[PDB]
Design a binder for these strands. Structure first.
Ligand SMILES: [Mg+2]
Ligand SMILES: [Zn+2]
Ligand SMILES: [Zn+2]
Ligand SMILES: [Zn+2]
Ligand SMILES: [Zn+2]
Length: 1223
RNA sequence: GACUUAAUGUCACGGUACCCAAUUUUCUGCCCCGGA
RNA sequence: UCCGGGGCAGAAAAUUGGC
């Protein structure tokens, strides 16, 4: 009679706003959602209401379930036969029903004795309500032979509490892009999944068929179901506004976005990073502390303010607090700066006689083989019922209300339909609102396939994948192109459920299941979700146990267990003997190699190209946001990803370092782009270029999918990350800039101990032979070192030594005369200043025709220079990773002692010093701008140092005014440098300068190194900037070596340093990779490397002390278009670089140019080859009472600084004339 | 009860939020004259 | 009339556009 039944959902069911049938046609969302749960509004304001399922929808699910139940038993149920029913109402007889059937109606052979009427009817006709007083117009409730009441939600209620408006999608198969999209309210089944309704039934004759069909209704409102018969955001925004205003007080509004990113990544670290003060604390003796976390907000530091914020907001979660405060810091930073929905016929379908219809349930685990991404709209746009940009995360991952990662049913079905279309070899694009069912072979099996929404048992916050678009022309970031993606970890496991209701299990669906399988030999190939081309969402199907119900003989056991709907998790973990009755294992599951549609359609669909990248350089794919939130306290640390482990059911405690798949993708896309010229196209709208076919565009998906490059070598490194300090040296003052000092934390890669980066990509079936050749050429381009991975590639980072592909796929003969003063004074009595200034002039040529990076120009020169660096003096390149490298700070506290620079033991010179000293030589040689200049530094006074410097010598800001030749070759902030200086590895020579008195014999305690003082170079306000400071080549290191005892006892230990020093005669080899260089530019760069026989370079510490005279000798110039450039063409390159400087001024003899003659005598080596000259070069002491003063000489700053003895004009021309006598 | 259904007919599990985009560009861990 | 002294320790740019 009154059968009160209960409807519980086991996945997120779809909800829609209720409209009456006259008003339902006005809204396309409700017309599309006629088969959903309905939502009316209660009260006013459209904020509260109540969800329900219409009884017509429950009747439609039941009547569909009766038809399938009667088709299994040939129109019978428990003995009593049933007729075919009726599913046709005439329009002339009466009004049509509110829902018209479009599907095929399951029919049988009518074994009923008499016809069905009002006097006596079959149980099919009773449950249809064919012959009762109730009809198309409802008047009263007891006219119904069977009544279905509305199913109210068994829980006023707000719509945001129950449902979340999610934009779903329709992806085109051929292009891989969404044709259109539509929005549904996927309501939460864990709190609001239970629905209670009433089913009245006057006739007892259809009682057994009704309750069994209640147990046979598998899905309703988009969700699997069993039917059983019974404000801190405001205060966070205010405090974020306080923090933004406080940052605006120190003129640091640009750091608020950095802080908003850094707060949003603190949800991964837990509350202990703020509670236990695990944020980095700045330098060891820095009064300013950290540059971000110690910014004074209302008089106290930002770390203490975040402590107070977390104590004030401890009632919410740490994840929610870091998400909203990171969002609110982002939102206030913004104030201070194809939607598509949707002739009736009756289709009688009778199954063949004696056929066997089975229910194949596939329970498995969707393991994320790659980091994954499932797309969702922004939470501001995800609000249901509410159908300046405000996106802190550009792409959020789809989560629950419990923040667990979600594979939707829709995205699993869409990837299954795509893979079944591939497996069948044909298919349809899914037409919407069609009156006729699609007869395509995919849609037939899609109608038989039922899946489940899977959620991981994991609710940790998503990792953030920052992506940029590189500007093709400048090889810097594109203006505007920076965005972030919430991704899930690899190894994450999702409960996979597939249900097939059909006669035979199709050979194409079992092909897709075996395609998705990880198994042993193959890879798991379930591409689910979005950004697949950047390897987001390649899932593996593991722990597969396909079971099968028998629905023709054991259909009561299917109804009794309700198809194990919602109990599929228990189905995956029980044994074989613990299975319910009627559920047998499917032992006839076809194997991988015995499948006809798998072998020719799915297996060759994406071809794996796995390979290992040999990185013989320190690899830095920078994660600056993670650098701010980690206690290592570096400005740039290498990228690492959190990887979930299914064995430990948690993230692995050591994050795997990786070059990002997006970086892996964009290097290949650049490499094809500059080889084809497709990177230089202005727009790629409706483009069928070679790079747009391969890598996709705004319209087509990519035919290549790139995975992350796993560091598979990290266990073999004792110290896997190297600390490399970096600094920018002012061109006028030989020391550091006023703000430009920093450090990187790359993976410690070296030529003898390289980093192995195992990464793979996938190649689409149908790839052209030219397109296959372009990828291998791009693969060979990375193997040939043309594209360094990560940041600082021009400084020597991420240089690729080679690529291993897996099996399953010269002298410069110029002699400068030098200076006459050391040649005339052969007794070494004459005393010279350690540095002199190069006053080249105020004429800087700026090329507005900026050389593009978008292609390898055929007339321009690209290649590699192998250079041997020979130390002419003892050379100091300190390993400033350890301030106690020589292990002597116990005896001398505060005495900073460094080893020589080394990565994984072997002695290295970083290419930053090789680039920076060559840049300082190239900018001096080419009359360039002062690219690193202390403009903000004052004098002791009318103007700053930037006022004293000429406007042409000022550093190049932007590309609009042109670039100076040093800034054109070596780059600006708006332009990647076209030269790349590798790290110099050690080969041969006497390794260490051995001193008997020092506690390490290889070491040397030096004199003190104080900051360069512009007041000596600029004595008054009437004097300009003297020019580029260059240090002389002298053997004043021999003085320091012989007073090692005296230096250590009359100089305070924390004032000077002790360093491991090479001896004279050591050979280093660095590669200078160059791209798109001129005929004259390479020759000037070759001249900048090897300027002459007696000309060298000053490198590393102790340049005023005579250390670091390095002789760079070119071994081999190799250029590609790969060939070896002969000596005749190398000299011919250098000749056209000479008349380029001649045309700027208005056997190359470089001494006839006045600024190159002064520069080359500044870099002239008087003690080179067979020469008895040993010029004495040292700075004056202050007074006669200062230590290190030779008695009887006037070499003091009291007399040289006195205007009466040495006038101010004479001191500048004594400083701007190299090798001038100072004593 | 109503909110909130229509009953001889709901393929909406009929629709992958998908497609593009290299956290990168520049920068020598360097260094001498004063301070009240 | 006095006999020393460390500095910088990141700066700038993009923080989303198109379909
Ligand atoms: Mg009726
Ligand atoms: Zn009947
Ligand atoms: Zn179809
Ligand atoms: Zn294109
Ligand atoms: Zn410049």
């Amino acid at each position: 009679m009154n059968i009160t039944v209960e409807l519980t959902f086991f996945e997120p069911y779809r909800l829609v706003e209720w409209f009456d049938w006259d008003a339902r046609k006005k809204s396309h969302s409700a017309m599309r959602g006629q088969a959903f749960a309905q939502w009316t509004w209660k009260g006013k304001g459209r904020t509260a209401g109540k969800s329900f399922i219409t009884g017509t929808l429950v009747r439609s699910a039941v009547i569909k379930a009766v038809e399938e139940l009667l088709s299994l038993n040939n129109g019978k149920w428990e003995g009593v036969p049933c007729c075919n029913g009726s599913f046709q109402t005439d329009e002339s007889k009466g009004k049509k029903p509110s829902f018209l059937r479009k599907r095929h109606t399951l029919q049988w052979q009518a074994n009923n004795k008499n016809i069905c009427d009002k006097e006596e009817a079959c149980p099919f006709c009773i449950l249809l309500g064919r012959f009762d007083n109730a009809g198309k117009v409802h008047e009263r409730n007891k006219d119904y032979d069977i009544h279905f009441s509305n199913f109210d939600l068994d829980h006023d209620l707000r719509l945001v509490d129950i449902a979340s408006g999610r934009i779903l999608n329709r992806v085109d198969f051929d292009t891989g892009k969404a044709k259109d999209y539509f929005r549904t309210w996927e309501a939460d089944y864990e709190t609001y999944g239970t629905y209670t309704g009433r089913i009245t039934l006057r006739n007892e004759h259809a009682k057994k068929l009704l309750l069994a069909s209640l147990g046979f209704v598998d899905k309703l409102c988009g969700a699997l179901c069993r039917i059983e018969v019974i404000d801190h955001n405001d205060e966070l925004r205010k405090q974020a506004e306080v923090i933004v205003e406080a940052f605006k007080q120190n003129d640091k509004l640009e750091k608020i976005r950095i802080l908003a990113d850094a707060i949003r990544t603190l949800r991964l670290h837990g509350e202990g990073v703020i509670e236990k003060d695990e944020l980095p604390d700045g330098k060891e003796e820095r009064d300013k502390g950290h540059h971000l976390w110690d910014i004074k907000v209302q008089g106290t530091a930002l770390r203490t303010k975040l402590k107070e914020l977390w104590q004030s907001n401890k009632d919410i979660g740490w994840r929610k607090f870091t998400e909203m405060l990171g969002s609110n810091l982002y939102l206030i930073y913004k104030k201070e700066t194809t939607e598509y929905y949707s002739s009736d016929l009756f289709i009688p379908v009778t199954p063949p006689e004696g056929i066997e219809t089975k229910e194949w349930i596939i329970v498995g685990r969707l393991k994320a083989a790659t980091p994954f991404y499932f797309g969702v709209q922004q939470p501001s746009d995800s609000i249901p019922g509410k159908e300046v940009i405000n996106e802190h995360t550009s792409f959020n991952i789809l989560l629950d209300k419990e923040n667990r990662y979600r594979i939707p049913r829709s995205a699993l079905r869409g990837a299954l339909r795509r893979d079944l279309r591939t497996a069948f070899g044909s298919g349809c694009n899914v037409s919407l609102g069609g009156q006729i069912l699609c007869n395509c072979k995919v849609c037939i099996e899609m109608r038989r396939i039922t899946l489940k929404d899977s959620v991981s048992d994991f609710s940790e916050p998503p990792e953030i994948r920052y992506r940029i678009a590189k500007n093709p022309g400048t090889a810097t970031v594109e203006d505007g192109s920076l965005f972030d993606i919430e991704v899930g970890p690899e190894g994450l496991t999702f409960p996979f459920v597939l249900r097939y209701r059909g006669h035979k299990f199709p050979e194409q669906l079992s092909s897709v299941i075996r395609y998705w399988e990880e198994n042993d030999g193959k890879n798991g190939m379930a591409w689910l979700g979005g950004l697949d081309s950047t390897g987001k969402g390649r899932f593996a199907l593991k722990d597969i146990k396909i079971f099968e119900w028998d629905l023709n003989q054991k259909i009561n056991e299917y109804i009794k267990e309700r198809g194990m709907r919602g109990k599929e998790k228990e189905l995956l973990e029980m044994g074989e003997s613990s299975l319910p009755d009627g559920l047998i294992p499917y032992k006839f599951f076809e194997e991988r190699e015995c499948l006809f549609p798998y072998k020719e359609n799915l297996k060759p669909q994406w071809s794996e190209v796995q390979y290992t990248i040999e990185v013989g350089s320190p690899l830095l794919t920078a994660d600056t946001i993670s650098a701010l939130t980690e206690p290592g306290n570096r400005d740039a640390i290498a990228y690492k990803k959190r990887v979930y482990n299914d064995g430990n059911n948690a993230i692995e405690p050591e994050p795997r370092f990786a070059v990002k798949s997006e970086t892996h993708r964009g290097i290949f896309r650049t490499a094809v782009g500059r080889r084809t010229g497709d990177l230089g196209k202005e727009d790629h709208e409706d483009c069928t270029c070679d790079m747009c076919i391969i890598f996709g565009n705004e319209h087509e998906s990519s035919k290549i999918r790139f995975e992350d490059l796993e560091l598979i070598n990290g266990n073999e490194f004792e110290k896997l990350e190297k600390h490399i300090d970096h600094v920018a040296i002012d061109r006028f003052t030989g020391g550091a800039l006023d703000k430009a000092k920093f450090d990187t934390y790359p993976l410690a890669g070296s030529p003898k101990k390289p980093l192995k980066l195992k990464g793979r990509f996938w190649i689409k079936k149908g790839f052209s032979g030219d397109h296959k050749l372009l990828i291998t050429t791009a693969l060979s381009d990375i193997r040939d070192g043309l594209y360094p991975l990560g940041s600082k590639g021009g400084v020597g980072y991420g240089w690729v030594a080679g690529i291993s592909i897996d099996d399953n796929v010269i002298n410069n003969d110029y002699v400068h005369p030098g200076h006459q003063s050391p040649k005339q004074d052969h007794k070494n009595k004459n005393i010279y200043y350690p540095h002199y200034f190069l006053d080249s002039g105020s004429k800087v040529y700026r090329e507005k025709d900026i050389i593009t990076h978008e292609e390898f120009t055929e007339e321009l020169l690209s290649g590699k220079i192998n250079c041997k660096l020979e130390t002419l003096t003892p050379l100091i390149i300190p390993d400033t990773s350890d301030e106690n490298g020589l292990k002597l700070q116990g005896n001398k506290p505060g005495h900073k002692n460094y080893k020589f620079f080394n990565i994984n033991g072997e002695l290295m010179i970083p290419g930053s010093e090789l680039r920076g000293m060559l840049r300082t030589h190239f900018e001096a040689l080419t009359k360039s701008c002062f690219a690193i200049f202390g403009e903000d530094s004052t004098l002791s006074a009318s103007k700053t140092l930037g006022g004293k410097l000429d406007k042409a010598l000022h550093p190049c800001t932007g590309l609009s005014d042109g670039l100076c030749p040093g800034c054109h070759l070596f780059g600006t902030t708006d332009y990647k440098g076209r030269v790349k200086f590798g790290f110099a590895k050690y080969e041969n020579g006497p390794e260490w300068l051995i001193t008997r008195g020092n506690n390490p014999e290889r070491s040397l305690t030096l004199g003190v190194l104080e900051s360069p003082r512009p007041a000596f170079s600029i004595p008054d306000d009437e004097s300009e900037i003297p020019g580029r400071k260059f240090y002389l080549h002298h053997n004043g290191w021999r003085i320091i070596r012989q007073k090692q005892l005296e230096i250590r006892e009359t100089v305070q230990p924390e004032r000077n340093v002790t360093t491991e020093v090479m001896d004279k005669g050591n050979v280093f080899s660095f590669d200078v990779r160059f791209e798109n260089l001129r005929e004259w530019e390479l020759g000037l760069l070759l001249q900048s490397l090897d300027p002459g026989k007696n000309i060298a370079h000053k490198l590393g510490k102790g340049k005023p002390y005579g250390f670091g005279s390095v002789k760079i000798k070119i071994d081999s110039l190799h250029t590609f278009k790969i060939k070896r450039v002969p000596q005749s063409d190398i000299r011919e390159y250098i000749n056209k670089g000479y008349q380029k400087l001649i045309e700027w001024s208005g056997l190359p003899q470089w001494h006839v140019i006045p600024h190159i003659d002064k520069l080359y005598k500044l870099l002239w080596v008087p003690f080179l080859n067979d020469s008895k000259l040993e010029p004495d070069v040292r700075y004056p002491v202050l007074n006669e009472e200062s230590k290190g003063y030779i008695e009887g000489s006037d070499y003091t700053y009291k007399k040289l600084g006195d205007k009466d003895n040495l006038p101010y004009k004479t001191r500048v021309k004594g400083l701007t004339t190299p090798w001038s006598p100072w004593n």
